[PDB]
Amino acid sequence: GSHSMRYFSTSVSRPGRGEPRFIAVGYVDDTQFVRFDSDAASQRMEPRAPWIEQEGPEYWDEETGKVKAHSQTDRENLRIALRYYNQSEAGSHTLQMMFGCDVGSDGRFLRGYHQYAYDGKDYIALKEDLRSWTAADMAAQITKRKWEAAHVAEQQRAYLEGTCVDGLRRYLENGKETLQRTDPPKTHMTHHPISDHEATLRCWALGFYPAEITLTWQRDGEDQTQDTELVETRPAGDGTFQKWAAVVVPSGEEQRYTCHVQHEGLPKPLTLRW
């Protein structure tokens, strides 16, 4: 019922090899729809979903302008973080940003996000009250004090509660066929002896959207949390997702094990048994 919009940006400094590389991508829920790459020839925000290609030329000009300004801002922020942490200009460093919003089935604002990571660890994040910041260390507390004095958080609220919500609502309508559908998992299981004493049972979920899913193995009704091999949900490449969960079972006892699949596209949770 609820939906999200997120932009993810990465700036990576390359000492001796030019200005930092900046990459930004936009998602609605689990569907990517735009990208920008500062090393690419075009220097334009580019469509990555069929339904965003309806947007007119003023959209692409304006979004290009915004993402280019971000690339220059975080270029500067890398140099500032370098100074706050007392680091040399010899090494390569990473600054990541995520921002966007969650909306309810209502369509109305639920949450907004505006957060940074430096070299893979939290730097500063906007708290849920959209009035205050959470800073990860003493370096980020410098930025926190400066941003509190300048009321940076307040000046983000129009975007987070207005533009973001409005844009998300427009994408969900324009991409309705894609973004508002639910593809349930197609499920199956495989069975491989690994000895004459044990066998692997693997529970598969294929072709599903959105990416959220739960696969769990039970033995005689008891969850087998610490004996299950569970892979990270992975993209099929066609906009749907895959996952599997496996357990090693004593040969001849396959029938005590059940795989349980929950997904928003299933009216009913599934139970699979070999």
């Binding site: 932009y7 930004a24 936009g26 925000m45 979004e63 915004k66 993402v67 300004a69 971000h70 801002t73 975080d74 500067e76 922020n77 500032i80 973080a81 706050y84 940003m97 921002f99 500063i124 410098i142 930025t143 400066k146 941003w147 300048a150 940076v152 983000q156 975007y159 533009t163 973001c164 409005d166 844009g167």
Partner: peptide, 9 residues
């Protein structure tokens, strides 16, 4: 829709 991001650390 992207945001306008100009604020520095």
């Amino acid at each position: 829709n992207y945001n306008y991001l100009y604020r520095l650390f």
